[PDB]
């Protein structure tokens, strides 16, 4: 769809939060570039959580409406529940 | 005796007028609010060869938008309706050129009569009610909430709003007493407004089948 | 619960329009008091 | 049986002229066996608040929405008898989903297995080789959802 | 909607607790009169309730559905957040509101 006519709850829920925090951290585990500056920690979970706080996660979420039409949301316009 | 029969016919007539008003029809206000004394005064006194003969208690009433549909509800005198009664009742239709009517069956009816009513016509719509069914009002009960029948444009507006198909909606049987009470064909969608103790008021959509 | 916030079955049959008739999860809901139903008409007019 | 109720659930509660709820003790009748269809038709009973315990008869007399509300009240009564409380949302879900097909969905081998759902979810709960043989004979498709 | 006087009912966020939190965070004094105009409360409740979305839409069907779903929390919200109750027993201030 286009920019207009886009309806879904804008609060990024816990399930896609866990999914993104898993997928991007595994991408660090497979030596992908890291979108944020880090200060002396090596756990991919910690840096992935830190850049989820920083809201610089370079993937988008394709949400399946029950009608059948897809709907694409990025990370930076979704706001964190925490 | 005569007293219990007058009470039964008064309750049946009051429920029939309530049915016509809930469906929405040109029912006068004092006709809906009839006491037992008024019923003994205007449509005769004691039954069983008195002024009530189970023939003059019929009701003819038309729709608010256009006065043409005009149900002519019946009241058979026999405990059972054998086919010749249905034949003369449907011969009485085209003389008055009416489409809708109802039958209040006293005790029961034959399998062959039921067969003839179900395969009668899509132009001669005829409903079946039992006598003891009309001593109570279903919508007046606490457990049964308010039912509202939509028009087709409201149904397609609903399906455009929620992006649903006709299959995906919740279903309700055509033999349900509320669906028979409202007199609705298959394919319509009823609006049910029930109260809830966690959201105040809920709206539930059902599609008959 | 689908992403239209409608409770649906496996083959996409609507069971609830919203979760719990209001669309709210049960983890955060609390026991509360209305304090409007129980007072009388005189008390309601005095207090509101 | 005749007994004046003591719990406020079965007691008469009406509004008054001052707007205050008042507890009124009125005579109630509890029976054995269900004959509700002739019970409400009888003289001097209240056709509004009278309910029962059986589900098939209250389906045949009132309607599936009355089945919904009565099933809600009976499940709430049987769970919350001993003081244990459970949230309304799950009860509302179960009561809608046993009344969403137009008839009484029994949560048994004979009730859930008669849907238009996928046969592979059907064979995960009871009569497993029989419903798979049914799907093979009819050639029906599983939309895998 | 509610017979038998069952005033106990489940709602999402406990209003009296947040009012008490607003009292005991900003150190307001219930003895002294407060500075909170009643229509600030009125259009605060009105402008708040338009942003509690459940059924999101603009057509009257979705608006009616949203009103139906939000009705119990709204009917408790307007009762708890009334002007007289605020002026008498809560005594909140503007930034507290």
TrEMBL record, chain A:
It comes from Sus scrofa (Pig). One of its GO terms (biological process) is transcription by RNA polymerase II. Its main location: nucleus. Keywords: DNA-directed RNA polymerase, Nucleus, Transcription. The chain holds residues 46 to 127 of 127 of the full protein. This is DNA-directed RNA polymerases I, II, and III subunit RPABC2. It comes from the Eukaryota. DNA-dependent RNA polymerase catalyzes the transcription of DNA into RNA using the four ribonucleoside triphosphates as substrates. Common component of RNA polymerases I, II, and III which synthesize ribosomal RNA precursors, mRNA precursors and many functional non-coding RNAs, and small RNAs, such as 5S rRNA and tRNAs, respectively. Pol II is the central component of the basal RNA polymerase II transcription machinery. Pols are composed of mobile elements that move relative to each other. GO terms for molecular function: DNA binding; DNA-directed RNA polymerase activity. Belongs to the archaeal Rpo6/eukaryotic RPB6 RNA polymerase subunit family. Transmembrane segments: none annotated. It is found in: Nucleus. One of its GO terms (cellular component) is fibrillar center.
Automatic annotation (TrEMBL), chain B:
It is found in: Nucleus. Residues 3-93 form the RNA polymerase Rpb5 N-terminal domain. GO terms for cellular component: RNA polymerase I complex; RNA polymerase II, core complex; RNA polymerase III complex. PROSITE patterns: RNA_POL_H_23KD (PS01110). InterPro entries: Arch_Rpo5/euc_Rpb5, RNA_pol_Rpb5_N, RNA_pol_Rpb5_N_sf, RNA_pol_subH/Rpb5_C, RNA_pol_subH/Rpb5_CS, RPB5-like_sf. GO terms for biological process: transcription by RNA polymerase II; transcription elongation by RNA polymerase I; tRNA transcription by RNA polymerase III. Keywords: DNA-directed RNA polymerase, Nucleus, Transcription. One of its GO terms (molecular function) is DNA-directed RNA polymerase activity. The keyword Nucleus applies. Its main location: nucleus. HAMAP family: RNApol_Rpo5_RPB5. This is DNA-directed RNA polymerases I, II, and III subunit RPABC1. It comes from Sus scrofa.
UniProtKB/TrEMBL annotation, chain C:
It is found in: Chromosome; Cytoplasm; Nucleus. Belongs to the RNA polymerase beta' chain family. DNA-dependent RNA polymerase catalyzes the transcription of DNA into RNA using the four ribonucleoside triphosphates as substrates. This is DNA-directed RNA polymerase subunit. It comes from Sus scrofa. The chain holds residues 873 to 920 of 1984 of the full protein.
